[PDB]
Amino acid sequence: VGSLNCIVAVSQNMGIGKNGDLPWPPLRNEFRYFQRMTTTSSVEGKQNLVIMGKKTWFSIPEKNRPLKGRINLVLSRELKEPPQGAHFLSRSLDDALKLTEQPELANKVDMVWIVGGSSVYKEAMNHPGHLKLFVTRIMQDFESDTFFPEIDLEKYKLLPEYPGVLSDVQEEKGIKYKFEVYEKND
Ligand SMILES: NC(=O)C1=CN([C@@H]2O[C@H](COP(=O)(O)OP(=O)(O)OC[C@H]3O[C@@H](n4cnc5c(N)ncnc54)[C@H](OP(=O)(O)O)[C@@H]3O)[C@@H](O)[C@H]2O)C=CC1
Ligand SMILES: CCc1nc(N)nc(N)c1C#C[C@H](C)c1cc(OC)cc(-c2ccc(C(=O)O)cc2)c1
Ligand SMILES: [Cl-]
């Protein structure tokens, strides 16, 4: 299995959710970015693995679960079997990561993407090792009931550019935003 990555879209007030939906109106190209980044394998014959919490899983429109072209894994201590549509279920992020060493996932998996929510991000960000954070900074405040944990700027470095990612300001539906990539090593 390849590298470990987080990807998130965050409002200025650090919001990522609201009533089980995105805090902002649908941003078509932010979504395409998310889709292409998590779906694109760098290795032929392999798929990427996306890891999400239970609320993130159920906040996805039923018609689009599981996330297409990716191995979906859900984190929960409460579910006893993967929800309808899902392949895998782990108790925690670390169980999930160790699960990628097993034959049935190794060989099969290229990159690992953490796609939400708040608690899963927390765990991932503090996980030891090489980690990349793909952060979309939505440049305005939205009312939110879930939040993205602050990035420890002592561990993480912000890259000026990342290959295949535009650095300049984006805008859809009146809303400006920017694609950022952070890196650390332990
Ligand atoms: N804009 C973005 O980039 C993102 C937006 N979102 C938004 O965020 C909101 C949901 O995210 P969140 O609120 O954080 O809910 P989560 O996706 O974190 O799932 C929360 C539930 O899943 C289980 N869970 C979560 N983390 C773990 C863990 N580390 N180990 C075990 N079980 C875990 C728990 O249920 P149990 O008791 O079963 O363990 C927890 O109550 C939604 O509104 C969604 O739209 C989602 C992802 C990112
Ligand atoms: C596109 C939003 C986004 N951007 C970035 N930069 N990082 C992320 N992690 C997510 C995210 C997300 C979660 C998985 C999410 C939440 C959600 O709340 C309604 C909806 C979706 C979602 C998934 C798939 C489709 C689809 O295929 O049509 C639509 C909405 C997906
Ligand atoms: Cl596309």
mmCIF file of C-alpha atoms and ligand atoms in Angstrom:
data_model
loop_
_atom_site.group_PDB
_atom_site.id
_atom_site.type_symbol
_atom_site.label_atom_id
_atom_site.label_comp_id
_atom_site.label_asym_id
_atom_site.label_seq_id
_atom_site.Cartn_x
_atom_site.Cartn_y
_atom_site.Cartn_z
ATOM 1 C CA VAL A 1 0.000 0.000 0.000
ATOM 2 C CA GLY A 2 1.168 3.510 -0.832
ATOM 3 C CA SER A 3 1.046 6.668 1.275
ATOM 4 C CA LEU A 4 -1.342 7.932 3.950
ATOM 5 C CA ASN A 5 -3.392 11.042 3.151
ATOM 6 C CA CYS A 6 -6.109 13.250 4.587
ATOM 7 C CA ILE A 7 -8.406 15.363 2.488
ATOM 8 C CA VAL A 8 -10.874 17.938 3.720
ATOM 9 C CA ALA A 9 -12.735 21.081 2.751
ATOM 10 C CA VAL A 10 -12.806 23.621 5.631
ATOM 11 C CA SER A 11 -14.606 26.960 6.162
ATOM 12 C CA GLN A 12 -12.870 30.008 7.692
ATOM 13 C CA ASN A 13 -14.374 29.201 11.085
ATOM 14 C CA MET A 14 -12.933 25.675 10.682
ATOM 15 C CA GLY A 15 -16.338 24.190 9.839
ATOM 16 C CA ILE A 16 -16.672 20.950 7.878
ATOM 17 C CA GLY A 17 -20.285 19.958 8.602
ATOM 18 C CA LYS A 18 -23.797 21.144 9.445
ATOM 19 C CA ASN A 19 -26.846 18.963 10.165
ATOM 20 C CA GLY A 20 -25.182 16.082 8.343
ATOM 21 C CA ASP A 21 -24.499 18.228 5.292
ATOM 22 C CA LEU A 22 -21.750 20.457 3.976
ATOM 23 C CA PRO A 23 -21.904 23.923 5.561
ATOM 24 C CA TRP A 24 -21.813 25.568 2.131
ATOM 25 C CA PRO A 25 -23.764 25.123 -1.130
ATOM 26 C CA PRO A 26 -22.402 22.448 -3.527
ATOM 27 C CA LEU A 27 -19.092 23.461 -5.159
ATOM 28 C CA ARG A 28 -18.925 21.414 -8.348
ATOM 29 C CA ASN A 29 -15.145 21.707 -8.881
ATOM 30 C CA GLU A 30 -14.240 21.300 -5.243
ATOM 31 C CA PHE A 31 -16.176 18.029 -5.498
ATOM 32 C CA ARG A 32 -14.431 17.048 -8.743
ATOM 33 C CA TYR A 33 -11.096 17.749 -7.046
ATOM 34 C CA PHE A 34 -12.097 15.504 -4.149
ATOM 35 C CA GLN A 35 -13.237 12.788 -6.556
ATOM 36 C CA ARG A 36 -10.173 12.829 -8.723
ATOM 37 C CA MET A 37 -7.681 13.055 -5.849
ATOM 38 C CA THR A 38 -9.174 10.127 -3.876
ATOM 39 C CA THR A 39 -9.964 7.950 -6.878
ATOM 40 C CA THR A 40 -6.729 8.261 -8.867
ATOM 41 C CA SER A 41 -4.365 5.373 -8.197
ATOM 42 C CA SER A 42 -0.680 5.837 -9.033
ATOM 43 C CA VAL A 43 -0.360 2.068 -9.585
ATOM 44 C CA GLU A 44 -2.036 0.080 -12.366
ATOM 45 C CA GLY A 45 -4.437 -2.632 -11.211
ATOM 46 C CA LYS A 46 -4.744 -1.126 -7.714
ATOM 47 C CA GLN A 47 -7.471 0.987 -6.164
ATOM 48 C CA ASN A 48 -7.290 3.618 -3.476
ATOM 49 C CA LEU A 49 -8.800 3.054 -0.041
ATOM 50 C CA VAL A 50 -10.996 5.737 1.501
ATOM 51 C CA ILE A 51 -11.499 5.708 5.278
ATOM 52 C CA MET A 52 -14.411 7.528 6.919
ATOM 53 C CA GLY A 53 -16.385 7.719 10.146
ATOM 54 C CA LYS A 54 -19.980 6.456 10.397
ATOM 55 C CA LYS A 55 -21.587 9.919 10.227
ATOM 56 C CA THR A 56 -19.565 10.812 7.137
ATOM 57 C CA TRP A 57 -20.668 7.528 5.555
ATOM 58 C CA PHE A 58 -24.348 8.162 6.249
ATOM 59 C CA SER A 59 -24.145 11.858 5.215
ATOM 60 C CA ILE A 60 -23.316 10.679 1.694
ATOM 61 C CA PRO A 61 -26.423 10.406 -0.550
ATOM 62 C CA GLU A 62 -27.499 6.763 -0.592
ATOM 63 C CA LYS A 63 -27.348 6.738 -4.384
ATOM 64 C CA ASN A 64 -23.609 7.470 -4.255
ATOM 65 C CA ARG A 65 -22.532 4.985 -1.569
ATOM 66 C CA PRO A 66 -20.110 3.441 -1.720
ATOM 67 C CA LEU A 67 -17.769 6.037 -3.208
ATOM 68 C CA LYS A 68 -17.269 4.649 -6.726
ATOM 69 C CA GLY A 69 -13.913 3.333 -7.930
ATOM 70 C CA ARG A 70 -12.536 3.173 -4.398
ATOM 71 C CA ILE A 71 -12.428 0.562 -1.644
ATOM 72 C CA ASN A 72 -14.640 2.044 1.105
ATOM 73 C CA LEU A 73 -13.909 1.434 4.775
ATOM 74 C CA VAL A 74 -16.027 2.675 7.663
ATOM 75 C CA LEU A 75 -14.876 3.308 11.242
ATOM 76 C CA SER A 76 -17.255 2.449 14.092
ATOM 77 C CA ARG A 77 -17.222 0.728 17.514
ATOM 78 C CA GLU A 78 -20.970 0.311 17.360
ATOM 79 C CA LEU A 79 -21.748 -1.304 14.008
ATOM 80 C CA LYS A 80 -21.206 -5.067 13.947
ATOM 81 C CA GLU A 81 -21.036 -5.416 10.184
ATOM 82 C CA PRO A 82 -20.171 -3.010 7.349
ATOM 83 C CA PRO A 83 -23.249 -0.954 6.407
ATOM 84 C CA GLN A 84 -25.121 -1.852 3.196
ATOM 85 C CA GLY A 85 -22.795 -0.915 0.337
ATOM 86 C CA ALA A 86 -19.597 -0.990 2.417
ATOM 87 C CA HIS A 87 -16.826 -3.596 2.149
ATOM 88 C CA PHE A 88 -14.977 -2.991 5.366
ATOM 89 C CA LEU A 89 -15.529 -1.902 8.956
ATOM 90 C CA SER A 90 -12.833 -1.220 11.552
ATOM 91 C CA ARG A 91 -13.066 -0.209 15.213
ATOM 92 C CA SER A 92 -10.466 2.522 14.811
ATOM 93 C CA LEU A 93 -8.068 4.226 12.448
ATOM 94 C CA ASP A 94 -5.187 2.068 13.652
ATOM 95 C CA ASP A 95 -7.149 -1.162 13.213
ATOM 96 C CA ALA A 96 -7.958 0.101 9.710
ATOM 97 C CA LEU A 97 -4.332 0.850 8.931
ATOM 98 C CA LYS A 98 -3.182 -2.557 10.202
ATOM 99 C CA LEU A 99 -5.940 -4.156 8.116
ATOM 100 C CA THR A 100 -4.152 -2.855 4.993
ATOM 101 C CA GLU A 101 -1.260 -5.259 5.708
ATOM 102 C CA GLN A 102 -3.519 -8.316 5.221
ATOM 103 C CA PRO A 103 -3.421 -10.103 1.825
ATOM 104 C CA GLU A 104 -7.007 -9.204 1.045
ATOM 105 C CA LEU A 105 -6.139 -5.460 1.075
ATOM 106 C CA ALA A 106 -2.418 -5.372 0.377
ATOM 107 C CA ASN A 107 -1.756 -5.974 -3.322
ATOM 108 C CA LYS A 108 -5.246 -4.528 -3.877
ATOM 109 C CA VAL A 109 -4.659 -1.041 -2.425
ATOM 110 C CA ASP A 110 -2.554 1.926 -3.542
ATOM 111 C CA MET A 111 -3.160 5.148 -1.598
ATOM 112 C CA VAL A 112 -5.090 5.570 1.633
ATOM 113 C CA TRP A 113 -7.355 8.610 1.970
ATOM 114 C CA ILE A 114 -8.991 9.802 5.194
ATOM 115 C CA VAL A 115 -12.125 11.674 4.127
ATOM 116 C CA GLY A 116 -13.778 12.513 7.476
ATOM 117 C CA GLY A 117 -14.954 13.334 9.926
ATOM 118 C CA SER A 118 -13.522 15.418 12.770
ATOM 119 C CA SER A 119 -12.388 12.582 15.054
ATOM 120 C CA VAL A 120 -10.885 10.549 12.234
ATOM 121 C CA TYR A 121 -8.910 13.642 11.181
ATOM 122 C CA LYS A 122 -7.615 14.138 14.744
ATOM 123 C CA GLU A 123 -6.377 10.548 14.946
ATOM 124 C CA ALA A 124 -4.857 10.640 11.486
ATOM 125 C CA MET A 125 -3.093 13.961 11.937
ATOM 126 C CA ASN A 126 -1.356 12.741 15.088
ATOM 127 C CA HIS A 127 -0.566 9.300 13.657
ATOM 128 C CA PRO A 128 3.212 8.855 13.483
ATOM 129 C CA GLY A 129 4.894 8.679 10.068
ATOM 130 C CA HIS A 130 4.665 10.321 6.625
ATOM 131 C CA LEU A 131 1.401 12.169 6.284
ATOM 132 C CA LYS A 132 -0.076 14.553 3.701
ATOM 133 C CA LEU A 133 -2.995 16.890 4.353
ATOM 134 C CA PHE A 134 -4.974 18.148 1.376
ATOM 135 C CA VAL A 135 -6.893 21.124 2.712
ATOM 136 C CA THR A 136 -9.365 23.226 0.743
ATOM 137 C CA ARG A 137 -9.577 26.601 2.511
ATOM 138 C CA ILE A 138 -13.041 27.949 1.788
ATOM 139 C CA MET A 139 -12.528 31.658 2.232
ATOM 140 C CA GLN A 140 -15.614 32.625 4.235
ATOM 141 C CA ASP A 141 -17.575 31.677 7.352
ATOM 142 C CA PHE A 142 -20.414 29.194 7.341
ATOM 143 C CA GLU A 143 -22.571 28.036 10.227
ATOM 144 C CA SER A 144 -21.211 24.645 11.236
ATOM 145 C CA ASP A 145 -21.717 22.049 13.944
ATOM 146 C CA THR A 146 -18.594 19.959 13.150
ATOM 147 C CA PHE A 147 -15.015 21.182 12.945
ATOM 148 C CA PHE A 148 -11.588 20.414 11.553
ATOM 149 C CA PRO A 149 -8.818 20.191 14.191
ATOM 150 C CA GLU A 150 -6.097 22.823 14.056
ATOM 151 C CA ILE A 151 -2.979 21.791 12.196
ATOM 152 C CA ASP A 152 0.140 21.510 14.316
ATOM 153 C CA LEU A 153 2.448 23.838 12.372
ATOM 154 C CA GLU A 154 5.407 22.454 14.316
ATOM 155 C CA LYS A 155 4.989 19.037 12.702
ATOM 156 C CA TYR A 156 3.421 20.042 9.388
ATOM 157 C CA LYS A 157 4.976 22.146 6.654
ATOM 158 C CA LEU A 158 2.827 23.942 4.071
ATOM 159 C CA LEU A 159 4.019 23.336 0.482
ATOM 160 C CA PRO A 160 4.089 26.305 -1.885
ATOM 161 C CA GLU A 161 2.957 24.024 -4.761
ATOM 162 C CA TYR A 162 2.012 20.405 -5.164
ATOM 163 C CA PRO A 163 2.109 18.553 -8.523
ATOM 164 C CA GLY A 164 -1.227 18.569 -10.252
ATOM 165 C CA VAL A 165 -2.679 21.066 -7.756
ATOM 166 C CA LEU A 166 -3.405 24.681 -8.718
ATOM 167 C CA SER A 167 -2.156 27.258 -6.166
ATOM 168 C CA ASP A 168 -4.342 30.182 -7.156
ATOM 169 C CA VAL A 169 -7.762 31.261 -5.860
ATOM 170 C CA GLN A 170 -10.821 29.339 -7.093
ATOM 171 C CA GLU A 171 -14.383 30.633 -7.193
ATOM 172 C CA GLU A 172 -17.800 28.994 -7.635
ATOM 173 C CA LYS A 173 -21.257 30.255 -6.647
ATOM 174 C CA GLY A 174 -19.703 33.452 -5.292
ATOM 175 C CA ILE A 175 -17.374 31.538 -2.979
ATOM 176 C CA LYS A 176 -13.591 31.848 -3.110
ATOM 177 C CA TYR A 177 -11.309 29.027 -1.990
ATOM 178 C CA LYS A 178 -7.801 27.649 -2.287
ATOM 179 C CA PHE A 179 -6.212 24.192 -2.464
ATOM 180 C CA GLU A 180 -3.468 23.661 0.130
ATOM 181 C CA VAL A 181 -1.165 20.712 0.767
ATOM 182 C CA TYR A 182 0.679 20.116 4.071
ATOM 183 C CA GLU A 183 3.397 17.540 4.756
ATOM 184 C CA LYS A 184 5.078 15.948 7.826
ATOM 185 C CA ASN A 185 7.440 13.064 8.646
ATOM 186 C CA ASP A 186 6.500 11.965 12.227
HETATM 187 N N1 LIG B 1 -16.097 19.115 4.200
HETATM 188 C C1 LIG B 1 -15.309 17.982 4.429
HETATM 189 O O1 LIG B 1 -14.155 17.923 3.964
HETATM 190 C C2 LIG B 1 -15.914 16.937 5.240
HETATM 191 C C3 LIG B 1 -17.237 17.081 5.543
HETATM 192 N N2 LIG B 1 -17.860 16.117 6.321
HETATM 193 C C4 LIG B 1 -19.028 16.485 7.177
HETATM 194 O O2 LIG B 1 -18.685 16.204 8.536
HETATM 195 C C5 LIG B 1 -19.869 15.748 9.245
HETATM 196 C C6 LIG B 1 -19.623 14.387 9.876
HETATM 197 O O3 LIG B 1 -18.294 14.299 10.232
HETATM 198 P P1 LIG B 1 -18.286 13.807 11.941
HETATM 199 O O4 LIG B 1 -19.365 14.692 12.426
HETATM 200 O O5 LIG B 1 -16.842 14.064 12.319
HETATM 201 O O6 LIG B 1 -18.860 12.294 12.045
HETATM 202 P P2 LIG B 1 -17.760 11.076 11.660
HETATM 203 O O7 LIG B 1 -17.728 10.909 10.169
HETATM 204 O O8 LIG B 1 -16.544 11.422 12.449
HETATM 205 O O9 LIG B 1 -18.409 9.699 12.239
HETATM 206 C C7 LIG B 1 -18.739 9.988 13.547
HETATM 207 C C8 LIG B 1 -19.183 8.689 14.135
HETATM 208 O O10 LIG B 1 -18.493 7.624 13.448
HETATM 209 C C9 LIG B 1 -17.829 6.845 14.440
HETATM 210 N N3 LIG B 1 -16.426 7.243 14.470
HETATM 211 C C10 LIG B 1 -15.826 8.472 14.078
HETATM 212 N N4 LIG B 1 -14.486 8.485 14.264
HETATM 213 C C11 LIG B 1 -14.215 7.202 14.802
HETATM 214 C C12 LIG B 1 -13.029 6.578 15.212
HETATM 215 N N5 LIG B 1 -11.840 7.242 15.111
HETATM 216 N N6 LIG B 1 -13.012 5.295 15.714
HETATM 217 C C13 LIG B 1 -14.247 4.693 15.779
HETATM 218 N N7 LIG B 1 -15.460 5.140 15.437
HETATM 219 C C14 LIG B 1 -15.416 6.430 14.937
HETATM 220 C C15 LIG B 1 -18.545 7.145 15.830
HETATM 221 O O11 LIG B 1 -19.639 6.412 15.907
HETATM 222 P P3 LIG B 1 -19.461 4.912 16.894
HETATM 223 O O12 LIG B 1 -20.114 5.310 18.222
HETATM 224 O O13 LIG B 1 -20.255 4.045 15.966
HETATM 225 O O14 LIG B 1 -17.973 4.766 16.878
HETATM 226 C C16 LIG B 1 -18.833 8.655 15.647
HETATM 227 O O15 LIG B 1 -19.949 9.013 16.403
HETATM 228 C C17 LIG B 1 -21.025 15.608 8.208
HETATM 229 O O16 LIG B 1 -21.856 16.719 8.345
HETATM 230 C C18 LIG B 1 -20.288 15.601 6.849
HETATM 231 O O17 LIG B 1 -21.018 16.213 5.819
HETATM 232 C C19 LIG B 1 -17.331 14.802 6.313
HETATM 233 C C20 LIG B 1 -16.032 14.615 6.033
HETATM 234 C C21 LIG B 1 -15.125 15.762 5.725
HETATM 235 C C1 LIG B 2 -16.499 16.991 -1.815
HETATM 236 C C2 LIG B 2 -16.392 17.359 -0.329
HETATM 237 C C3 LIG B 2 -15.088 17.157 0.160
HETATM 238 N N1 LIG B 2 -14.075 17.955 -0.210
HETATM 239 C C4 LIG B 2 -12.828 17.778 0.260
HETATM 240 N N2 LIG B 2 -11.837 18.573 -0.127
HETATM 241 N N3 LIG B 2 -12.552 16.803 1.130
HETATM 242 C C5 LIG B 2 -13.525 15.989 1.544
HETATM 243 N N4 LIG B 2 -13.286 15.001 2.404
HETATM 244 C C6 LIG B 2 -14.824 16.134 1.063
HETATM 245 C C7 LIG B 2 -15.866 15.254 1.504
HETATM 246 C C8 LIG B 2 -16.678 14.525 1.882
HETATM 247 C C9 LIG B 2 -17.666 13.560 2.380
HETATM 248 C C10 LIG B 2 -17.186 12.153 1.992
HETATM 249 C C11 LIG B 2 -18.915 13.794 1.801
HETATM 250 C C12 LIG B 2 -19.883 14.445 2.558
HETATM 251 C C13 LIG B 2 -21.142 14.693 2.020
HETATM 252 O O1 LIG B 2 -22.083 15.338 2.772
HETATM 253 C C14 LIG B 2 -23.301 15.442 2.037
HETATM 254 C C15 LIG B 2 -21.432 14.288 0.725
HETATM 255 C C16 LIG B 2 -20.473 13.632 -0.046
HETATM 256 C C17 LIG B 2 -20.790 13.220 -1.350
HETATM 257 C C18 LIG B 2 -20.177 12.088 -1.876
HETATM 258 C C19 LIG B 2 -20.460 11.641 -3.168
HETATM 259 C C20 LIG B 2 -21.379 12.326 -3.959
HETATM 260 C C21 LIG B 2 -21.656 11.874 -5.257
HETATM 261 O O2 LIG B 2 -20.995 10.922 -5.764
HETATM 262 O O3 LIG B 2 -22.560 12.435 -5.926
HETATM 263 C C22 LIG B 2 -22.009 13.465 -3.443
HETATM 264 C C23 LIG B 2 -21.718 13.906 -2.144
HETATM 265 C C24 LIG B 2 -19.205 13.383 0.499
HETATM 266 CL CL CL B 3 -13.280 14.900 -13.811
#
